[PDB]
Design a protein around this ligand. Structure first.
Ligand code: NAP
Ligand code: NAP
Ligand code: NAP
Ligand code: NAP
Ligand code: UD7
Ligand code: UD7
Ligand code: UD7
Ligand code: UD7
Ligand code: UD7
Ligand code: UD7
Ligand code: UD7
Ligand code: UD7
Ligand code: NA
Ligand code: NA
Ligand code: NA
Ligand code: NA
Lengths: 346, 346, 346, 346
């Protein structure tokens, strides 16, 4: 459910706003809360086409479609009036497009987040959850750097805003299995096309999680985050060399593998918690919570006092979590209805 | 000199603008070009006090003092008219202040750099060199993240602007020995005060370079960078445990060492070139040049083609350069007139 | 071709920018010029997903993908540098979404067009063609009103800018057969679903044209418009009552028709030239050209001098063009490969 | 009075703000409420001269004069603090000047109205009445188009703002007899000058109303409008051919008539309610009220549900109201003290 064990709220008078509400998570998150008592789900984005498609498929009078842009504080303010909860998912999230147009990544991902927070605070929103990415930890490309900076901005706002006024937190997650354009659909299309599998670096690792796991992480933050927290779902990882084998064996196929090399903008492994975040985090079980440090603007934490737990820690990354076996990758692959349909169809 | 072997220019009709011109580098860079043929050095910053101090100390009619703010495109445009060269050194550069006010770090370091580039291009400036920091490689604090994003922005502008119109490049350097507030003056003050040396993590490493080495790196970029390049000076490093010993032996002092632990916002070692940058860089000798990739907006470099040299490389960092011995640290320490004066005086 | 009879240009050194370049026309217009000598086609829009899809389908090194927003003059300026020709197709074009968020329609369709024109003029673009709609003539809904105002803005700019500097014109067209969401796909889906055809007002008329006819109109303006002109393609029309019959007979189907009534925001017939435009227009044959009036800011044309040709004229609309017979509608329907495939498949 | 039969309010603690407060309506509306209990009437405009003239003529300590511009939200906010009621009359309202400078018409009439509404809402104003024009229905010139778009903007704001917070409505009226520069003073001046009457199109019709009728319409909206309503006063009309005869017979004059032809930017007849507005309106008697449709952002009203009452209706225009006889035009002309004085004086 959407509510901790031993609570209830009833969302029967509550309004959820989803920025970037037409994209993959916005939709999965939308479709989760449609399974609820919620009075209204406002879908806020720039794109009238994607909005009309969703409207017509769901025909649900809970859904309201707002045209607007996180870059524009007036357009956010219109959609934010009377809102209780915000899932902030609006972003430029593709690596190459942020790398070539990084000022657009700063306008949407960094300034656009500050506008959403400022409007949410003015409108007395109860909670804002900002979506981020493992590419924001030790980042190397403009998309991850802009997301890392977005995290600093929402953490900084949480220090100066009381929790009871507006609680502000965020989620960072790994690689969503079978994202549009991502490596699983790519490889399947190569299997079916009779093409070789283009492997970048077979020993490269990525955290592996489903879209459903990604929605649970947001719900987990919605229920349990404190203001300033970054919530991360613990996740296993796969090497690309093993993921490709898993798919080949499942599809009973003997397409060759071709090594194309590491592409620009990519790391060998992804980090979900930096050394410092790990040192400071609380283990919630299937999640880590990274609380905001120095909530009173405690300069001396950066200057004159240290923490030996930081020196003693190391980062949480896709090399040091459980790296799945080919068998495990297969089982996890088979929980996806995308893989099943393609499989049956093959 | 300011000109490659086998060239001359004469700067006798040339105008240099230094944003952040009143800070430590701006001044050292200013005082280098005062040693030149340059027609005019404009010092651009926000602070009328620091400007008046410099004016009165130098009394040099080459120096012109402009009040203005990189955040404001009109104020930059006033100072940029008729300029040939820009050293862009304006920045919020202190870790804690960027971490608590990251929107100010985005306004000055990222948006302020885009305003300087746009104005330089409109005014037909020949070259703009942007100063950056090893904290921008795999960054973990808001100051390094904003500087990493500044680098993406100037690299992106260089792809879309012809070199012959305006050449745009930047420099990244390590820890400047005996910066205001930095660990060498701190430890000396503890030596002289009879206080214990507060060591954060004795095995922490930082690249070690002088302010003079930092000015040479900027001059090196001024002379040799191509548009889009990031230039880094190769540098040795010290552990903090060894730097403290070097100072203690020099000062013939037996203050105790106290371990305070790693402070927030700090890494164990600093990186000057990421894995990818190292793979792509050219070794100029005492420098590496990191050329801009995908200058034609080549998406396919991020998506469908890879580079096996990236897979084969690793990052250039303060653990894997030459880590100096206590003896070496001492010799390097003694090249500083700050250390000498304090030493004699002790 | 893209060039008048008795001319040649060679577009071999030329750059075309398409704002809204990922939408239906942008693409058809893009795919037309791919059939040409053109050096570069820049696709400018806000959406990185749609851009990546197009890139990957075409794999054509002429295509460059710019992320940006017509609302933001800096982001337009980046994409406009070195451009020769602009097809301005960026717009919020859905009736309900403009009616509920008309300030967003004013920001994109009116202010966004002024930013494109101002940037094109600063960058010495040769020609800008602005796309408009018959809903802008005697308009009744916020989408048509914003498009009518966009036309006034580009006409006003053409009076004050010399043609040899930048030529600025626009196109207005009717209902594109088999647009996403439009009545032909709707009715086909009802045919195939066994559902009744929902007819709004069977005697309602709309101009009928194909997407290919729409691209020709833009090319016609590209080749022949003078600055300030509005170009309209003459077109026949259908009643909805007749279009529905045409589809039923083609699909050899006897789904019932249900009258739902006129929807909000709709006219009984659409106008392509107002009384005044018709009075002033030149007949180019399959097109009318509406030249800009009062090019010297001739107030007296609105105040003290009149034109008896205006009094004598009437508007050009979907009731007074050739209204096609069911047979004609069928023949025109069959020129569409969308209709053919659906037909065969049925 | 200013209050419905069976109510009272006492305006003894109330503050009225009139934007465009120095123009013809602002003044007539001002002079109406001076005839009241109102605590304060603030006159808001840009022009210090017109403000000083009014101040000095009335010498009334209820009148306060604010300099400011509807284009500037801070300047509106200063004048809006503690306001109860707003009559928004600020506008660029001349046809040629909007047609040549339509971006100025969009800044004042559309964006300026959104700033007034946003400030009124922030300041807890009770009611805002926006003045519009029959030129906004099926509009053909930039002035009417900007006013049509202003109406969409205030209607859209009324859907998202509760009535009890701020009620937002508007008025549309026809041709005010003996406006500065309008056809009645023009013709009188020709009568007195011995010049021929320049008639544009003698069969052209315009709604005829006095300034006093125009103030009553605003008061009617003030008392009875609901949020989102457009209120129109029913009105008879005159042909220009008949108005000219009426004036000639009254002035016992035989100046010839010259036909100059229809001028740019003019329709043959003006519309006060479009087909759709008429279908949806309630007849209040001497007024129609057009309520806002789809107050819950009901997309389906534009897309999947229709209204047969719309199909069955037609527009309310100056051809289909009561067209007055020459005798009627004369009687109505004689109710004007402007006509009387000119008449006696002749
Ligand atoms: N691969 C992944 O799925 C993944 C992994 C880690 C983190 N994340 C993060 O989770 C969030 C959503 O992920 P997703 O996969 O759902 O992304 P997605 O499908 O691309 O959705 C994000 C949505 O952002 C909207 N948007 C973009 N710019 C906007 C603006 N300026 N104003 C308002 N809306 C805007 C877009 O919709 P319109 O075109 O309709 O405006 C888009 O559909 C993003 O913040 C992303 O960083 C995603
Ligand atoms: N420790 C180091 O020295 C070190 C190491 C690596 C990289 N760097 C980089 O090198 C550059 C300069 O280093 P530095 O040590 O000379 O720094 P610094 O002494 O702090 O000087 C930077 C100058 O920036 C100016 N400034 C700040 N905001 C500005 C704005 N909004 N508009 C115009 N001027 C502004 C300030 O002068 P006013 O107060 O007069 O405006 C300040 O003196 C910075 O970009 C820094 O990131 C420094
Ligand atoms: N039914 C018709 O086809 C029809 C009829 C008459 C006239 N027209 C006109 O012709 C033009 C294009 O028609 P179309 O059918 O190709 O429309 P469309 O497919 O919706 O394409 C327009 C494109 O506008 C882009 N866009 C929207 N806001 C933008 C912004 N703020 N900055 C940059 N790009 C933006 C969108 O792409 P992103 O989401 O990638 O930004 C969208 O794909 C429009 O002006 C429309 O008014 C169309
Ligand atoms: N013929 C008619 O009378 C007629 C018919 C139908 C509708 N209307 C509408 O009714 C309203 C007023 O009619 P009216 O005849 O009283 O017009 P008017 O006498 O021209 O008065 C409008 C006032 O607008 C003020 N104004 C213009 N731009 C402004 C800005 N940017 N900020 C603040 N004030 C501004 C001007 O005063 P300053 O120069 O002192 O700023 C002007 O006196 C207008 O909205 C008009 O559209 C008029
Ligand atoms: C370039 C780009 O668009 N990256 C988007 C993407 O980020 P990630 O790179 O993490 O995901 P992927 O599914 O593409 O790589 C999976 C693994 O397979 C490897 N990979 C990938 C493609 C391939 O052909 N071969 C291969 O081995 C690859 O090196 C990696 O080890 O996905 C999300 C949606 C984004 O935000 C980014 O814009
Ligand atoms: C999960 C559980 O209940 N185990 C408890 C049990 O620990 P385990 O036996 O699991 O071994 P570890 O914790 O040493 O490393 C495991 C993984 O975590 C990550 N981990 C660990 C340390 C670190 O600094 N950074 C980090 O990412 C890294 O991915 C690494 O590979 O004891 C320690 C002291 C605890 O507090 C745990 O909650
Ligand atoms: C917090 C802060 O203001 N950091 C500024 C600073 O960045 P860095 O941290 O790199 O420099 P430092 O000279 O302070 O540390 C040197 C080494 O000594 C260690 N160090 C430092 C102080 C101490 O008491 N003990 C100690 O061991 C320390 O852990 C490290 O290993 O200097 C420049 C000017 C900035 O931009 C930053 O704002
Ligand atoms: C400096 C010179 O002239 N040496 C040449 C001679 O090399 P050396 O014997 O010096 O050993 P290496 O290059 O293996 O590593 C040295 C350091 O560089 C850094 N280095 C090296 C590789 C890398 O991927 N990343 C990196 O940072 C890292 O700090 C590491 O510790 O041969 C290789 C192949 C060259 O091309 C050199 O120019
Ligand atoms: C509401 C809406 O989104 N209108 C978009 C649309 O504008 P138009 O209305 O002109 O097109 P359509 O294909 O929908 O109507 C065709 C005719 O069939 C009639 N029509 C339509 C649907 C139906 O179920 N029944 C019916 O008779 C209808 O009354 C009309 O007589 O198409 C383009 C793409 C847009 O810009 C607008 O946002
Ligand atoms: C097309 C051609 O070559 N015909 C020439 C031949 O004309 P036709 O016999 O075709 O009859 P018409 O022009 O009277 O009306 C036809 C349609 O046009 C539209 N039309 C016409 C007049 C008008 O004011 N508005 C208008 O929209 C309206 O859709 C109407 O139903 O003589 C006149 C005087 C010309 O100048 C023409 O070029
Ligand atoms: C051009 C211009 O400034 N039009 C302003 C104006 O809008 P309207 O045109 O409605 O008013 P008018 O009194 O001028 O026309 C009355 C009738 O007499 C006819 N008319 C007018 C002048 C003439 O010489 N002869 C003539 O027959 C004329 O064709 C029409 O049939 O008045 C208000 C104040 C505005 O907002 C507009 O800016
Ligand atoms: C005013 C009154 O009390 N008459 C009532 C009495 O009506 P009347 O005998 O007056 O004839 P009508 O209503 O047919 O047309 C009159 C004028 O209105 C305008 N009118 C009318 C219909 C329309 O769709 N649009 C429109 O503008 C147009 O200007 C047209 O010329 O019966 C109908 C059904 C009513 O509901 C009325 O309230
Ligand atoms: Na707080
Ligand atoms: Na370049
Ligand atoms: Na011109
Ligand atoms: Na409301």
């Amino acid at each position: 459910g959407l509510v901790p064990r031993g609570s209830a709220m009833g969302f029967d008078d509550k309004i959820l706003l989803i920025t970037g509400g037409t994209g993959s998570f916005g939709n999965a998150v939308m479709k989760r809360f449609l399974d609820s008592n919620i009075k209204e789900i406002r879908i806020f984005s720039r794109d009238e086409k994607k909005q009309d498609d969703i409207r017509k498929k769901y025909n649900n009078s809970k859904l309201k479609f707002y045209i607007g842009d996180v870059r524009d504080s007036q357009s956010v303010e219109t959609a934010m009036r009377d809102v209780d909860y915000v899932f902030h998912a609006a972003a430029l999230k593709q690596v190459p497009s942020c790398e070539f147009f990084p000022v657009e990544a700063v306008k949407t991902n960094i300034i656009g987040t500050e506008n959403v927070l400022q409007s949410a605070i003015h409108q007395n929103v109860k909670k804002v959850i900002c979506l981020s990415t493992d590419k924001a930890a030790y980042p190397i490309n403009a998309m991850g750097i802009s997301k890392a900076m977005m995290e600093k901005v929402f953490v900084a706002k949480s220090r100066n805003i009381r929790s009871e006024q507006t609680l502000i937190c965020g989620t960072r997650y790994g690689n969503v299995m079978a994202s549009r354009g991502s490596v699983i659909p790519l490889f399947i299309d190569k299997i079916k096309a009779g093409e070789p599998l283009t492997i970048t670096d077979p020993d490269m690792t990525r955290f592996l999680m489903s879209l459903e796991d990604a929605v649970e992480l947001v719900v987990h933050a919605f229920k349990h985050a404190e203001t300033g927290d970054i919530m991360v779902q613990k996740a296993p990882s796969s090497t690309v060399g093993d993921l490709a084998t898993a798919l080949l064996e499942l599809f009973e196929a003997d397409n060759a593998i071709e090594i194309i090399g590491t592409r620009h903008g990519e790391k060998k492994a992804e980090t979900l918690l930096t050394r410092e975040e790990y040192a400071q985090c609380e283990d919630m079980g299937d999640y880590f919570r990274v609380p905001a440090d120095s909530r009173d603007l405690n300069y001396s934490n950066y200057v004159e006092t240290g923490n030996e737990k930081i020196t003693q820690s190391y980062e949480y990354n896709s090399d040091n979590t459980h790296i799945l076996t080919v068998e495990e990758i297969k089982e996890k692959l088979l929980t996806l209805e995308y893989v099943r349909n393609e499989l049956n169809d093959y």
